[model samples]
Target: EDEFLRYLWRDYLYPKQYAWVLIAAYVAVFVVALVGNTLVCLAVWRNHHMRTVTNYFLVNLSLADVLATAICLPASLLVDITESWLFGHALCKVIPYLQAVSVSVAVLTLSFIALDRWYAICHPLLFKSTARRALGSILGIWAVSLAIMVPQAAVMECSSVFSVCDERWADDLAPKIYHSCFFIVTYLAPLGLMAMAYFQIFRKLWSAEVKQMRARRKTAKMLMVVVLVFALCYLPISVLNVLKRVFGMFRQASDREAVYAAFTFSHWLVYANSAANPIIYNFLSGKFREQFKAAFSW
Candidate 1:
């Protein structure tokens, strides 16, 4: 029994130096994501004028980031470093489910923001964009995400014999189908919509008065950069996950080191996305900068 338990306590595969570096990286992500996303929510909560439709959606985005950072990141970091799931059965389901829900909310929030902007900019009379509508949309986002991600939790299982947690689908083909649908619904489709909406907004603004156009253009550009950053960060991980789940690549012993390295970087990139948004907001929006600075004073 002692020898069997000893086998379960596997050592770190990374060099000591590399393990330290990874630890530091995840620690930084934790601090930044928690602090920055909290400030975003706080800023909007405190300032009446900051409660515009766009800012409402931004706050929703921040809340999703905060949820993912707080609930999901630590488990992910532990599992990645140890190459096993130590958190037991209940968490094995809950953590991945919450992560999926948060990601879905983030994507849907961004898509709605883009849709709101497109209508407000290009076809104002066709649809009225209002705070009440935005609130309803936020609720819808949560409901949809929560409902859609139930399967993720349902399919997760922790092995009794070994410290491993993974999706235990009924058949191999189920994971392939599910992952493909997840990629399309969460990542690819929303991005395509946002890109199209922004392109139209750009064209519509080009002929407007110079000062108005510049101000509108700045906000649109800021959102565009945020979307672009999200895409860049998630794209590699998304593709890598598909390759792993669908094609069964990276299973060979010879590919272990390279696969581990790739997955480490990819996971970091995903967490980094949760941290990057508030920085982009601070840099691009004068209001956010002032609020962030104000939070630091006595």
Candidate 2:
């Protein structure tokens, strides 16, 4: 993978003005994401009424985004500026795994949220009976996320002290297998489930005359934004990984550099979802906005 050489920071990739602009953009994203995700965490933590089973998923999701913002994102920005992994061997091995775990938990939690909302709307009694199951599911989500990322820790070998966090596979097939499998489990399956849930949800919303239809529709719109944002962030990187690394379609060094650049650029979109989520809730979720106000007013 000679394209690994293209891991040069933004300063070198673009001209002086553009590089500074890129730096400023990244810093803004970091600050906004941190503040927004933190506020969401606070709203859920401080408000008693926000402690419902549904909000439990939102809390977990916010925490996952916060983790990604604090851990992976800062490191990524540093790598973008310094053009190397200055964090050392231990972190070199660990940070990528943490990023993967955060992403896994996020998507999984989102899928669960869709499922929960579906049940609450389509089968209220059953949903109420099983709502308490959310805690167990949250635990399972983390467990599974951590478990799936174990290989990443092993896959990431510190080539040297200055080596960027690149995955080293024993065989060429290894990355293909891993990337393909991860795509199926993490992106395809969960997203498909969420899509089906939303389909059923929208169908019911349109067909039935429920008491809280307006409210439910508003919530659905918010989640639809969430899912769409997740897709926007992930789909580009996912496709690039499969096409370049797995399928080996992008053979030229320049081709891979383009792919890597696309991946890096799209990462900002992923972080934007983490930051923009709270704003989405503020606009769409009246209870969440009020809780945020109540928490901050003091």
Candidate 3:
């Protein structure tokens, strides 16, 4: 909580002139992410042909990015600029909890998209993704993400230093256990699954067996689906955050100004990922580009 905005240079804090760069970055991410992801959802919704099980996941992924961009970035920027958590007790718990939910859901859904494309390409006859299956998978993603987010809700408490909400467990072991588990479940496991899926996805398309089955196989669409998942759908840290509060508590004169400053800015940089989907859909896929263009020609 103390480190949340503590290290921003004095000149950058109030009066808000020098902080334009930081503020601009957050605004850019917010606008682009909100607008772009909204377009992604609209593109799918407007075009009945684009509504597939796979696209359903994209819609949800877009929804998640919107959540991150809409709520998380602005809240962080306010805290950084004002050096306070103005939202009070309820949001302190809800904001990070929802952030975790959205991001985790997006990550898991992406891995599922990769799996869907991998199954479609590598085992055409055997692996079929029905609407029923898609619905079940989407629900499963939500369930798992909600389940893992319990720790974020459970561990966060309002910091007395600035009254900002942050993660602080009673016992040291509890936080470590939570982080270790969170790291494994939230980041590690889904990432590993996505990596394996991509490996097989690339392998099957360019393999020797594929060469013999080119013309007969629907290879062109296969390339589009696989690469779409790879380039588009395919694809944080804790310890240092609150630990600085300990030093600040003891009045340690804290020379880590640069470090804390870096951490604060970098936290917002991650949200830039959410902003790229619109550009990707608009430029990368011809169908999306045409539909998006034709739909909004007015």
Candidate 4:
């Protein structure tokens, strides 16, 4: 009954001052992520010279970012500020499911980009890089991401007794098991593969002539930074989520403010990565910089 009253009254979780800060942060992320990623897609689409195997993968990455930013961020912000799932049962499942798919798409796309570059640079004779292959890989990425995130959507539920939406596994151990798998598949394994690929590429570039491979080197460097940002941005939330699922951390009522702050910052970091990617492209790629300037003028 008291919970009902709180829900009816729209009791915000964070203090008003802090909530505003979160609002500002989320709004900034939304605009930057949406606009920047859209520009990335447009820049690739409009220019034929920009249409390469790697750029197609980048377009996939930007599309995923745009999807997550558009569909997930608003619900996430509302949940953070209100500490309630106001969007109800259907959205509770769909939103998180899409978010997971987007994340999967991102990691997979980055891995493929790294692999493509590695094969192109490190073992140029072994594998043929083609637009047809890139297109097939992009389709495969979405197929895999969508298939993997079904469990996430299936597990989500809205509480009948409280204004909350969460993964309501049949057993406590289920979440732990699921999250562990998710962490390994989406975060650890992909990152490990990328690291090895980039390291080999790095060695190849270093050993060979510099001037001829400068453009390839620049592209690899930019993608490496994108992956690095993704890793760092996601680490906190991933760790916290695992800890929360496994050990029930951040449940103490006394630590409410701290918990909220921690979670807010972590979530922000995830969105920030979406925003950061285009910025990274702009700074590192002369081609991207020219395109972005052209984009801005129009």
Candidate 5:
């Protein structure tokens, strides 16, 4: 991958220095994400008062991002500095799997959070038991995510182009398995649940806010901030990724560059989401604002 980066300037029309810019941007994005997510986790963990079902889910997301950045940033940066993989066959075979697992864990954690918030707020009676049982749901998510991840992780194969890790399926089962697993569990189920949750969450909150304009506006603003930020960072890129990879599986790589650009932008966008959580928390909620500031001396 980094080898191709060299060709970005020698033959292509774009400026060579842009590669450095990309690298710098990625580094900055990753560092901030790492630090911010780490702080969020620490803040919640250290503060007994902040330890709730919501914070529990947030911790899962933070841990996932921390692990993902651990896998993606160094290896990617290593590839940029050299034309070949500095790490051997084993690393390339393993890192990508971890990356995949990390991403799945993160997304699933967020989905669970969204669903939890919805149930807690909208259909409070049915989920009232869940408030005391948040740990069980989280554990279940881990089990399900791990079970689904085995195919992706075990399908790893060595890359011909580089020494780094790439996924390989036994027989043609990789994409088939990936497609089925991805669509049903990862993509479809989560989106459907998330959509339903958000709808109910808003429906419940909308009416509640109508009674108290000031408190309602504050709540409304926070909800909008979360949904809008999530959409801005995730939705466009998700759509593009599904389109690109769905077509790529069919062996028609049209608009490949555009797809790559969308992916590149998406990675940063996702990282931005990771880092932006703390800011959103601080600004959007009085409780989180005070907790975040006092916990971190911010």
Candidate 6:
């Protein structure tokens, strides 16, 4: 794999720089995510009517996504510009972990939303507990994500070149082994679970005559659109990450070059998620579309 890994900068990149495109993209995403999520928070906080039990969880999900984008986007721009981890040895460890935690919370919150919806739909007779009392779950999600991402956070300790930073893992057997372990549990497993949750949720969404109803159909459509955006946005990167682990399984040439290409594509693809979600939300969710129209001229 090491042999396959060419200098990522030298080979696996656009012949012409797309720095501005990526920068603008990330910034746009950051702005939209912040605005949309903030609106959710404000609506619930300032307007009593908006603070339904269902929306209470939605509030946290929005907040978490906003926070995730906020934490990662700017630094990601810096990384692309500098072509390295720019923040610092300290941030090298901290940022990735923090980014991971926020991302975990965001996705987990989405799952929780789907689960809640399922409970409401499939098991309507079951008591739907108020998300207000269950707010404690957010804290737990935050804690577990932060803890799980510690190793990735620790990877951030490298020096920056004109704002580009590198991961700090020393080239040794143990560290690589740890990375492989982290890769499977931290990334692959969660992605699998996310997919699994979507599958089950959809099954419930489709069960009985309820599945073909138009309004419920619209709900399904919106959920599918947004989640598909999330999946497509991040899936390649997730696959490449696992590929990196796979390539790392052997210290060879072709694998490394493949890794380099995959890495380049994956990094850019992953960063694009920050902005893409808002576009998805605006298109899929009526509430977001309303706010988004007002926020922009269109």
Model 2 stretches with alpha carbons more than 4 Å out: 1-14, 127-132, 207-210, 249-251, 255-260, 295-298
Q: Which candidate, 3 or 6, would have the higher lDDT against the true structure?
A: 3
Question: By how many angstroms RMSD does model 2 differ from the true structure?
Answer: 5.5
Which pairs in model 4 have colliding backbones? none
How well is each residue in 124-201 modelled by candidate 3, as lDDT tens digits? 777779867897989888898889798788877777776777777687566656656665665567666766776676
For 1-298, candidate 4 gives per-residue lDDT tens digits of 5987776556654356577888999999999999999999989978888999999999999999999999999989998887789988899999999999999999999999998888888888898889998999999999999998998999998996657998887887888888889888999999999999899998988745656687787888888898899999999998888888877888889989788889889988999999999999999988888899999998
Query: Model 5 misses residue 208 by how many Å?
Result: 12
Report clashes for each candidate as comma-separated counts.
0, 0, 0, 0, 4, 17
How does each model score on TM-score? 0.92, 0.87, 0.79, 0.92, 0.77, 0.71
**Model 1 / residue 37 / CA error / Å:** 0.6
Candidate 1 accuracy as TM-score: 0.92
Give me the displacement of residue 171 in model 1, in angstroms.
Answer: 1.5
Per-model CA lDDT versus the true structure? 0.90, 0.80, 0.70, 0.89, 0.66, 0.62
Global CA lDDT of candidate 2, please? 0.80
Cα RMSD, model 1: 5.4
Error of 1 at 198 (Å): 1.0
Candidates ranked, most accurate by TM-score first? 1, 4, 2, 3, 5, 6
lDDT of 5 at 53: 75
Output the worst ten-in-a-row residue range by lDDT, candidate 6.
159-168
Candidate 6: tens digits of C-alpha lDDT, residues 128-181: 557555586667767777777776666665653444454555665655576567
Scored by lDDT, model 6 comes in at 0.62
Error of 2 at 16 (Å): 1.8
lDDT of 1 at 42: 93
Instruction: Point out the worst 10-residue segment of candidate 2 by lDDT.
Output: 2-11
Off by over 4 Å in 1: 1-14, 207-211
